[PDB]
Amino acid sequence: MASVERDETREHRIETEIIVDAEDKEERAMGWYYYLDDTLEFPFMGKWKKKSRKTSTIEEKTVEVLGMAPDDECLKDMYVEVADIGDDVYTAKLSDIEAIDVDDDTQEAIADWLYWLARGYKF
Numbered sequence: 054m055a056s057v058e059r060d061e062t063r064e065h066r067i068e069t070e071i072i073v074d075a076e077d078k079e080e081r082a083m084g085w086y087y088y089l090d091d092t093l094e095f096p097f098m099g100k101w102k103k104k105s106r107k108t109s110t111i112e113e114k115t116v117e118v119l120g121m122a123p124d125d126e127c128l129k130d131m132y133v134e135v136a137d138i139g140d141d142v143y144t145a146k147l148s149d150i151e152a153i154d155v156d157d158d159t160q161e162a163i164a165d166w167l168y169w170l171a172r173g174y175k176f
């Protein structure tokens with residue numbers, strides 16, 4: 054189900070800019086992957102909530118978000134590659150990233166993705 058009400062501005066943009074003619078799961082995933090890759094301005098900084106299910110703990114890491122992760126798990130979720138430069142590179146779910154002082158378009162694209170998930174939409 055949906056945890057937020059429809060936002061028609063986001064719906065229009067998703068329809069016309071992102072999903073476009075996509076019909077099946079792979080096409081819907083691909084649309085989002087290319088949109089995010091095109092619209093997020095890399096690199097940017099974010100707080101990553103890196104969770105450990107086994108120990109019930111959370112490490113909130115401050116990282117550079119370098120780009121989309123290579124598209125191996127594209128069908129399931131949107132992943133980005135992040136680095137802590139204190140170099141260790143990781144794969145993180147975009148939905149676990151809180152961007153820090155980014156430009157308007159990057160913030161918008163992240164919000165669109167968060168909105169899609171909140172609505173309960175899936176590829």
Ligand SMILES: O=C(O)c1cc(S)ccc1[N+](=O)[O-]
Pocket residue numbers: 079080082083086124127128
């Ligand atoms: O093959 C790919 O590399 C592929 C990548 C993405 S992001 C989405 C769908 C795909 N399909 O369907 O092939």
Ligand code: NA
Pocket residue numbers: 089090091092093094095
């Ligand atoms: Na980009």
